[PDB]
Design a protein around this nucleic acid. Structure first.
Ligand SMILES: [Mg+2]
Ligand SMILES: [Mg+2]
Ligand SMILES: [Mg+2]
Ligand SMILES: [Mg+2]
Ligand SMILES: [Mg+2]
Ligand SMILES: [Mg+2]
Ligand SMILES: [Mg+2]
Ligand SMILES: [Mg+2]
Ligand SMILES: [Mg+2]
Ligand SMILES: [Mg+2]
Ligand SMILES: [Mg+2]
Ligand SMILES: [Mg+2]
Length: 51
RNA sequence: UAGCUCACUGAUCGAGCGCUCUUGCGCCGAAGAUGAACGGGGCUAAGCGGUCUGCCGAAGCUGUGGGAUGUAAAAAAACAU
């Protein structure tokens, strides 16, 4: 069972997130955002990586 | 010739009715050659007028980002394109 666990792993349990979602306006489009997830948008002018 | 019948009149019946226009929408006039042939299915509105209010609808206008050309002679920032 150590071998058969190594080579055929069981699906791990899902990471915890809050049960919540929002609908937010960015660059005049509306996205549904759930926390922990990344989305694509219009360039935000004057935004730097790690902001 | 006769004969039938009409115009007109008396009577009966008891509440409307005559001849005129004129709008709107229809009917007939209207019939071809490969096969519904007029978008289709269908609809008495899901057709036609008139009025009220919602919505859909484009590469138009707005929103958020990039480019370029002209001002213009470095940029950057404007405006226009
Ligand atoms: Mg006769
Ligand atoms: Mg025929
Ligand atoms: Mg039709
Ligand atoms: Mg109408
Ligand atoms: Mg459009
Ligand atoms: Mg285009
Ligand atoms: Mg375009
Ligand atoms: Mg335009
Ligand atoms: Mg622009
Ligand atoms: Mg330029
Ligand atoms: Mg220029
Ligand atoms: Mg120049």
């Amino acid at each position: 069972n150590d071998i058969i666990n190594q080579f055929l792993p069981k699906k791990g349990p899902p990471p915890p997130r809050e049960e919540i979602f929002a609908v937010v306006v960015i660059g005049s489009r509306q996205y549904i955002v759930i926390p922990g997830r990344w989305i694509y948008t219009q360039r935000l002018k004057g935004a730097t990586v790690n902001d």
